[PDB]
Design an enzyme around this catalytic site. Structure first.
Site, mmCIF file in Angstrom:
data_model
loop_
_atom_site.group_PDB
_atom_site.id
_atom_site.type_symbol
_atom_site.label_atom_id
_atom_site.label_comp_id
_atom_site.label_asym_id
_atom_site.label_seq_id
_atom_site.Cartn_x
_atom_site.Cartn_y
_atom_site.Cartn_z
ATOM 1 N NE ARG A 25 -0.953 1.565 4.384
ATOM 2 C CZ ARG A 25 -0.948 2.684 3.916
ATOM 3 N NH1 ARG A 25 -1.759 3.059 3.129
ATOM 4 N NH2 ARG A 25 -0.661 3.622 4.884
ATOM 5 N NE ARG A 130 -18.227 -21.036 21.863
ATOM 6 C CZ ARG A 130 -18.718 -21.898 22.513
ATOM 7 N NH1 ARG A 130 -20.538 -22.253 21.669
ATOM 8 N NH2 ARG A 130 -18.734 -22.415 23.524
ATOM 9 C CB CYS A 149 -9.113 -9.467 12.615
ATOM 10 S SG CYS A 149 -8.793 -11.012 12.470
ATOM 11 C CG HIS A 150 -3.065 -7.740 10.225
ATOM 12 N ND1 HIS A 150 -2.144 -8.433 10.595
ATOM 13 C CD2 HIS A 150 -2.644 -6.704 9.404
ATOM 14 C CE1 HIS A 150 -1.191 -8.479 10.106
ATOM 15 N NE2 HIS A 150 -1.434 -7.307 9.476
ATOM 16 N NE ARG A 169 -5.123 -7.046 7.067
ATOM 17 C CZ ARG A 169 -5.739 -6.172 7.796
ATOM 18 N NH1 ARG A 169 -6.893 -6.370 7.931
ATOM 19 N NH2 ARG A 169 -5.642 -5.079 7.553
ATOM 20 C CG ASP A 172 8.502 -7.826 6.513
ATOM 21 O OD1 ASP A 172 9.072 -8.865 5.219
ATOM 22 O OD2 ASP A 172 8.661 -7.244 6.724
ATOM 23 C CG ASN A 180 5.180 -11.560 14.050
ATOM 24 O OD1 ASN A 180 4.447 -10.828 15.318
ATOM 25 N ND2 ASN A 180 4.392 -10.515 12.875
ATOM 26 C CG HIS A 210 4.882 -8.898 1.523
ATOM 27 N ND1 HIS A 210 3.648 -9.660 2.164
ATOM 28 C CD2 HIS A 210 5.473 -8.304 2.382
ATOM 29 C CE1 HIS A 210 3.731 -8.868 3.019
ATOM 30 N NE2 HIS A 210 4.474 -7.997 3.338
ATOM 31 C CE1 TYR A 212 7.705 -3.795 1.591
ATOM 32 C CE2 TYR A 212 7.350 -5.343 3.452
ATOM 33 C CZ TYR A 212 7.050 -4.448 2.757
ATOM 34 O OH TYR A 212 5.967 -3.925 3.613
#
Lengths: 265, 265
Positions: A25, A130, A149-150, A169, A172, A180, A210, A212
């Site tokens: 983006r 749940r 949500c992300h 979603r 990187d 993470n 993705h 970079y």
């Protein structure tokens, strides 16, 4: 039984070889693949990647800051990693749905404590499907009604073992993903500790995976490196509440990584 | 290039071989594995499983009923597949967040049209990483504030190709999964058609992937069957709006499956 890190390295290689050019983006170019998954055992080992030095102190300090529900940048930099960051991940974890006011405000008993609810659900019905918490990118919140949500984390219990699946979603692969993996694996160790369970698997699932363009050369070099056996994570103290954890309660043992790789943010 | 159905069959085999005994909320036993993923190409073929006959008419009629936003059971049985079903998936797709009243009520312009928003977002910014819609199990809605979703679909566009990833927090591998592969692959064909794109991949990701105990014997027999090449799906008419699709617009060609396998619901 192959080293779990080979999955990460195989995925990087796959994106380099098969990924398609796609802009983010901000308009910065990436190589992209849609839909990925990897499984890291948490049983008697901890998946802190070894093909480059991962900044464990930042992982640990940031997670503890999330758990506090803090929205103050200074409370993080002071640990060594104005200041009002908005309804960041921590606020959403502990005060989900509450109208954000000030970072100095008092949010006690306001919103849904997603994190404590996950813990409480594990304790009241470990079979529940749940056992999920979600987080949003703050910038999405005023964009539209009910933004998606992300990321979400789903937990799962069987045979006294706690597993966690993180769905993001977009991911990187060069900078964000190794960090993470450590971060959510650590969260699973904490929750397991609190609920009297042993850690099982951490499963990491991506939508847009993705790389970079400026990370391609460093990553190609990282791929030439053979993983060293994962370290272990020790919790040094019996802890009863998730809010009681401190950085000093944790000890990484036998971490023997290859040198640091700098990737331009 | 191996047949895509081999993934489904490998996953069934893995659960039979490695899955752990775990009860569902009804107390019926399953064999369970946490975290799975499979990728089905949609390019010049359609993933309607061939190792057993899948009820294509039900898939198509049910999806069209979802798209209509209907909450009337009779509107589905009449197609050959009182009557008020509550805020089912269709209502959530087209009127997200609206307070459900009657199945005869008028919900025009009420709630968020998640489905049209996905389409509109694909048209205004195909690179957007927020092209997501979600659905809830209706029973969860009055249980707690802000219950987690049951499933989400994330879409992705590159090189004029539309892909879709379905994440379900739990998946009935014997009965539910083959049906849902067809259902969301079909949804991706429809959205691709509307937005002027070609279908790419359908990626199916699960949290709790489970096999009911009474499905084990039928599934073991299904595993002895070799897949036949997937059929193709033809859209017979140029269609401009998602609400305009009718069952007669669709033609499955070259579907040559093994016999029907009955699995007790």
């Amino acid at each position: 039984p192959p080293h779990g890190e080979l999955q990460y390295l195989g995925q990087i290689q796959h994106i380099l070889r098969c990924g398609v050019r796609k802009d983010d983006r901000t308009g910065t170019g990436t190589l992209s693949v849609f839909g990925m998954q990897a499984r890291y055992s948490l049983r008697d080992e901890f998946p802190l990647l070894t093909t480059k030095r991962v900044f464990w102190k930042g992982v640990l300090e940031e997670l503890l800051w999330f758990i506090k529900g803090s929205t103050n940048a200074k409370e993080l930099s002071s640990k060594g990693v104005e200041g009002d960051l908005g309804p960041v991940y921590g606020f959403q974890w502990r005060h989900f749905g509450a109208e954000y006011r000030d970072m100095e405000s008092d949010y006690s008993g306001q919103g849904v404590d997603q994190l404590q609810r996950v813990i409480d659900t594990i304790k009241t019905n470990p079979d529940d499907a749940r056992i999920i918490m979600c987080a949003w990118n703050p910038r999405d919140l005023p964009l539209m009604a009910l933004p998606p949500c992300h990321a979400l984390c789903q937990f799962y219990v069987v045979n006294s073992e706690l597993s966690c699946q993180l769905y993001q979603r977009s991911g990187d692969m060069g900078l964000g993903v190794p960090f993470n993996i450590a971060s959510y694996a650590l969260l699973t160790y904490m929750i397991a500790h609190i609920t009297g369970l042993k850690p099982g698997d951490f499963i990491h699932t991506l939508g847009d995976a993705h790389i970079y363009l400026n990370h391609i050369e460093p990553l190609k070099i990282q791929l030439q490196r053979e993983p060293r056996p994962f370290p272990k994570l020790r919790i040094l103290r019996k802890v009863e509440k998730i809010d009681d954890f401190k950085a000093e309660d944790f000890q990484i043992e036998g971490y023997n990584p290859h040198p640091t790789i700098k990737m331009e943010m």
